[PDB]
Design a protein around this ligand. Structure first.
Ligand SMILES: O=C(CO)[C@H](O)[C@H](O)COP(=O)(O)O
Ligand SMILES: O=C(CO)[C@H](O)[C@H](O)COP(=O)(O)O
Ligand SMILES: [Fe+2]
Ligand SMILES: [Fe+2]
Lengths: 219, 219
């Protein structure tokens, strides 16, 4: 039940279709697409127009997990749905009413993700955990790739896994062949990996390794 | 007169290939639309895409950054480091045009100043002598393929008359159908999207825009 979703944040963004195609051909279970509006986090990546072009290049089959690091997630639900996103993962810190937003995401036919930054207590995620498809536990401060994995986040993963046995739990930030062990032992089953996969000459084997470490923990 | 294609409606999953075709077709520069989802209701891309584009396209091509962002002060260094040549910010968006103009120059970039259709051209007067280029929007910013606003031409004419040394750019629904109106009013930098982007022979369209604009200039 473990899935690997490469992040393309530090890929060749001038050739994004190509980068995504090769992640998929390398065995990626899904694509984790980082959307940053320069307000919720101090960086700007891309938005629904890029998603639309990607969906056109990759076809209908690939699963897009949209990491919405934006300050008004309500605004981009419909645009992302129309663009062909499968899952809309918004930040708990980015809205006054997660309940209403969750409803709107489903109304627009997408799966629901809910993310929390390192400084945000997992306790605040809990009231909504039964209403979402996937919780995202950030393992770096969002906005930049290539940062150091924060192992102190693991109790958040373990606690969610304990309280919500069926919940899909994603980790994101500095996850690689080493740190994936900590994530998997803590209970995570969805692994986002950027620089570790993207700056490897053999992404197939990195992905295979991440998934195996994960599966053995799930066992 | 210089022609700078806009890539707003291109295949955004292949920005490199799109821009390369534009340069190989003799584009004078590239006009790169940066939208943060706040100043305008759309998100395109930011400096990370610019960095990858600069790496793909080489040191020589000129990038005109149309910064439709609410905090233009924030992205000056990041765009400079990314390799942008000109930083064109919106007068409506800045807290302090004078300070920002200075910062742009401290960062080695040329200075552009843009105004939306509803913004009176006289707002530019205090700054025209400090900037390299004025951008007169000929559509409401946020999206490509909108209809050219001929009622903006008196702004262009007024600028050209009052500030003979000022480079003046028009942007929004400019193509072979409307370029003459822009040139006769005094624009010498022409941004065009759809009309160039779809062509089999972008070189011919670019040459046409440039020639129409140049001959109108010679009166
Ligand atoms: O959301 C993110 C950061 O905001 C990215 O998904 C994360 O950085 C993945 O990159 P890496 O594996 O290189 O840390
Ligand atoms: O800034 C812009 C819109 O916000 C674009 O540069 C403009 O739309 C150019 O595209 P087109 O030539 O298709 O109008
Ligand atoms: Fe992410
Ligand atoms: Fe523009």
């Amino acid at each position: 039940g473990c899935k690997i979703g490469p992040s393309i944040l530090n890929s060749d963004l001038a050739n994004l279709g190509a980068e995504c195609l090769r992640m998929l051909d390398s065995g990626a279970d899904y694509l984790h697409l980082d959307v940053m509006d320069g307000h919720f986090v101090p960086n700007i990546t891309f938005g629904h127009p890029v998603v639309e072009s990607l969906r056109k290049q990759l076809g209908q089959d690939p699963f897009f997990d949209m990491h919405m690091m934006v300050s008004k997630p309500e605004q981009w639900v419909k645009p992302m749905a129309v663009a062909g996103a499968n899952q809309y993962t918004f930040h708990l810190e980015a809205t006054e009413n997660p309940g209403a937003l969750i409803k709107d995401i489903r109304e627009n036919g997408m799966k629901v993700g809910l993310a929390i930054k390192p400084g945000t207590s997992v306790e605040y995620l809990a009231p909504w955990a039964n209403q979402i498809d996937m919780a995202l536990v950030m393992t770096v401060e969002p906005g930049f790739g290539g940062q150091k994995f924060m192992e102190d986040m693991m109790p958040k993963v373990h606690w969610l896994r304990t309280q919500f046995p069926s919940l899909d739990i994603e980790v994101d930030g500095g996850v690689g062949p080493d740190t994936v062990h900590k994530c998997a032992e803590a209970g995570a089953n969805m692994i986002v990996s950027g620089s570790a996969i993207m700056r490897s000459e053999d992404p197939r084997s990195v992905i295979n390794l991440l998934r195996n470490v994960c599966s053995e923990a799930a066992q």
